Amino acid sequence: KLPIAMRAVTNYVCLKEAYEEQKKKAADHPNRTPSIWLAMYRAFGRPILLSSTFRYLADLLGFAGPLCISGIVQRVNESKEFLENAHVLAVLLFLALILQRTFLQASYYVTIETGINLRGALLAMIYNKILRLSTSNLSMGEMTLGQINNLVAIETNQLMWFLFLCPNLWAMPVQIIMGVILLYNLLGSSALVGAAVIVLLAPIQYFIATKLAEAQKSTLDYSTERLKKTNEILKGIKLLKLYAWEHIFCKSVEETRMKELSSLKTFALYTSLSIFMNAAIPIAAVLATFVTHAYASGNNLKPAEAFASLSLFHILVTPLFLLSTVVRFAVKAIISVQKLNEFLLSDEIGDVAIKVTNGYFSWGSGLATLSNIDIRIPTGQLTMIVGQVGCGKSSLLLAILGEMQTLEGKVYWNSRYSVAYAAQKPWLLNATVEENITFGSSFNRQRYKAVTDACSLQPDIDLLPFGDQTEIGERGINLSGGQRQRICVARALYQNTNIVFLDDPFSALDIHLSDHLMQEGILKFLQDDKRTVVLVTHKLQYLTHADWIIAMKDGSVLREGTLKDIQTKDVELYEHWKTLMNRWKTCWWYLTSGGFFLLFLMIFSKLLKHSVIVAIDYWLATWTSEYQTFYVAGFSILCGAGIFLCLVTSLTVEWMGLTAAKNLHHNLLNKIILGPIRFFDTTPLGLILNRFSADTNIIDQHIPPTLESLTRSTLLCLSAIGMISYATPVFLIALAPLGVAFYFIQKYFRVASKDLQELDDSTQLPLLCHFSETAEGLTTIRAFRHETRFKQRMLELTDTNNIAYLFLSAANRWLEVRTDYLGACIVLTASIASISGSSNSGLVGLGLLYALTITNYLNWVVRNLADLEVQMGAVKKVNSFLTMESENYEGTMDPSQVPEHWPQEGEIKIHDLCVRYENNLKPVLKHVKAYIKPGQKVGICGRTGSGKSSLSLAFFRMVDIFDGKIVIDGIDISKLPLHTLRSRLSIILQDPILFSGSIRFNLDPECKCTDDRLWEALEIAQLKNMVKSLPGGLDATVTEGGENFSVGQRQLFCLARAFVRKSSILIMDEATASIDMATENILQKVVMTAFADRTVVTIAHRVHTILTADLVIVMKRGNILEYDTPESLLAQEDGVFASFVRADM
Ligand SMILES: CC(C)CCC[C@@H](C)[C@H]1CC[C@H]2[C@@H]3CC=C4C[C@@H](OC(=O)CCC(=O)O)CC[C@]4(C)[C@H]3CC[C@]12C
């Protein structure tokens, strides 16, 4: 598959051992900063040393040029008989050239091999780091999943590209100094002035690199922030669109984008300055050297000395072409390795089945979240943990798993055994349903079918495209919340471990599915296997089945024992429980984004600059043909104009790139957020966030440099061809054969590169997805103790990706070799033609010296052209989203028709409403009719899939209405603008979507609310005390996803977010699914006493809540069966609502 030397495992072992030695060295000194750079040096130096050796040989074979040009010019002008003959010299020059290119390609080969090995090793290192880092890093804002993915995607690759270019950073100094010494030999002391001019590049480039590094660090910071915001928007589109907050968040993202673009503009300015200095300092050096020689050495330059000197100046200039690129990549790689080294130095993890004694545990802050934890989990018996929101239940489970640092106490596990964890927030991989349920276990049809039947997944999976073999999770078909949770519980049940930790598996399930699970999946299956079970549920009706009961309050265990033991000891708690139970074209578009003034300005300026440079060389040739005021003046003005045009041409391309990036991202963002919700439901979030992150990174930072280098190289090559044709006209005859060869080699390689690039992309997306899915749900992987299998999967995937990239690099080597040999042929033919058929001795020198140049710059033209193609692909994709369908915000109803207080009364009339999500799909609602009075408390109930949530989203026109009316306060919502409808009605969704920032930001992003009303809403939502206790009060931070809070607390925050708006109609959709009964009862009482005037429709998770309601609706497959008061439905014999009440109680 891949040679043992290039397997990721061996390179990883080497790098890890070197890094561990560096860690020991750091431990010794107070510096205490293990350095990745030295570890990489020790591990992978010898390859780079070999590459440097090859490059140093190539440099001498390059200096071979000036000598032969001198000899040929001298002989055309006027033992060892073969040595001087011009044709013999030309043959020798061709041979030396091919050998130099061979050595150069050898160095490039060694460096690419080492870079790929090091990328594999580093990905392995940071992956093992992911498998070791503590979740308290992601929970407290120390880092994010986005940063962990950014490392893998951008920063490792940037370091790899830098390693590709690494040898230059010391080979170029050597070559420049050697050229200066030889120039001294030729030109006397006059060459030392030019030597000083050239030397001044080192201070200049160091300063420019300092500024570039500052700018790049700022750009990376702002890009991370911008992508954080964009990812949150893409994930929470549903809530943002329902609340009409889309544009506020879009504006915030645009502000961060403006800051990032300012940083990018500073970086572009200094990159343009570096290019300008690199190009100009040689022109100034030539001017100074030759003026000084004219005025110092009375003897004029004979043609031989002159053309040798000009050739040496070309040899000096050739390395300077790359210097800007290498400084760019070195600065970016320095920042990347700083990030990687920060990541790799972070926080890491430190009968009775499980007993905890005097356990104090904390979530990393250093303050105990649990205290005096004295518990025991009896072996082979069901334990049930019961408590109100935020009482340390999930915390207790994770503490037993050892996921949070222990301040005191011990845990005994009569090393940890594999425990089956079904986390409260279900986590699914990107494999099929069968792969999620089996989760690395031998398939057994009997057990698989039993578990699937227990979790009632069979009806759901046969409705999927390819039942039991459909790609689930991100990058595949999405599943409803209940489906995902039941799949996760099925995964937990199917494994053959002995301890099963189920953290609230009934949150999304309805009464029927929940009861079926509780009976068949747990009480029967797990007891038949005699497995220990620990349940964390608010379903107090199941306490009769429990064998051991743990009661938690305010982080500490209040009481523990059997039900009878609790009744005997703590009568209060048992009585409380009983009371609670009631017992291409894209390239042209990118270029045109400038507006036809910057594009044409750029092209014209670059043409003129290259013309002036070649004119400088021609003037030197003619001047030394003299063998004077006029010549010095002409030379000086030529050089000055060259410098000026260098400056202009340096600025133009970078400005074009800045503008293109800004416009592309702005269009993408604005069009994406306006799209219909169906688009986000259908398209995986990956296919959008990738556009926003990776393609945007390309368009911002990779296209402008590639384009500018491409233009420089191509214009140098064309200019050399023109100068040669002027020197020897017959060369135009030989131009056609070589051009044909060029076309054919490029044809073949371009198709090959397309194919291998497709392979590389297809092999890397699974690797990034693996890093993602392991970063998330880390606790699950470490609970099943499947870390070894995941390490193996990572190793094999990275080996596959490395094989793909190795083939791509081999194709690059093929084309580089072919084109370099074509250039060598060009040099040989041009030298012969100039020797035999040129008019003046000066012309042959110019022709030969530009023949030398074509070889180097043709390779760059080819390589940069291919890179520009692959990079324009992303512009093609980002622009593609500009084709999307956009939701109709216009609205037919006139603004004057809409009152100032539209939902003043709150009455709604639903007339023959029928709704479906996409055309040619099943109508989920069927001729539903409703009449809710103003100031009416309605309760809607039913089984999952009855269309309650469809009816809820109908009010906000998030579901397409085939036929019907929804008349709210006398206006058909279809006529109104979308935002006036979606802003004057409030809805509480079941799944809490909480953004990063303060409590204020989540409660009121617009900051249009006084703190008093925020406190009021928090008090209604039963969170006033917790927020008061928090360090910052209403300014306290919320991490991404609200992970620093409990799930129930997240839902309560989502309730406060709706209570603040204070509209007249409130659609609460199963909002108390994750909230416990104790909190839920008081919350409902307070909401009824507070919103008594408004109309509230509550899609209820438990019918006990809507037992007290003015009106009750029961849905069944989109049909309203019964429409009356709860008393009437209860008194109906064999009614549906009565059965619901019996089951729930
Ligand atoms: C002029 C001739 C003789 C050689 C042309 C290249 C060289 C001048 C070498 C010597 C000094 C080197 C530079 C000096 C140090 C840096 C800064 C370095 O980035 C940092 O030091 C981090 C930023 C910071 O210091 O805060 C990136 C490479 C770079 C530009 C080096 C690139 C290669 C340079 C320019």
Ligand SMILES: Nc1ncnc2c1ncn2[C@@H]1O[C@H](COP(=O)(O)OP(=O)(O)OP(=O)(O)O)[C@@H](O)[C@H]1O
């Ligand atoms: N990931 C976390 N990082 C840091 N602190 C946390 C984290 N999760 C919860 N906390 C803190 O732990 C305390 C206890 O919450 P815990 O996570 O144990 O909730 P829970 O009782 O299992 O939740 P619920 O019953 O509402 O589902 C909360 O006050 C919260 O501040």
Ligand SMILES: Nc1ncnc2c1ncn2[C@@H]1O[C@H](COP(=O)(O)OP(=O)(O)O)[C@@H](O)[C@H]1O
């Ligand atoms: N995002 C969606 N796209 C298309 N169809 C959906 C979507 N969500 C649910 N449905 C379909 O609508 C029907 C009712 O779903 P839903 O409204 O979620 O019921 P509930 O009232 O239990 O939430 C189901 O049969 C399901 O197939």
Ligand SMILES: [Mg+2]
């Ligand atoms: Mg919990």
Ligand SMILES: [Mg+2]
């Ligand atoms: Mg629903």
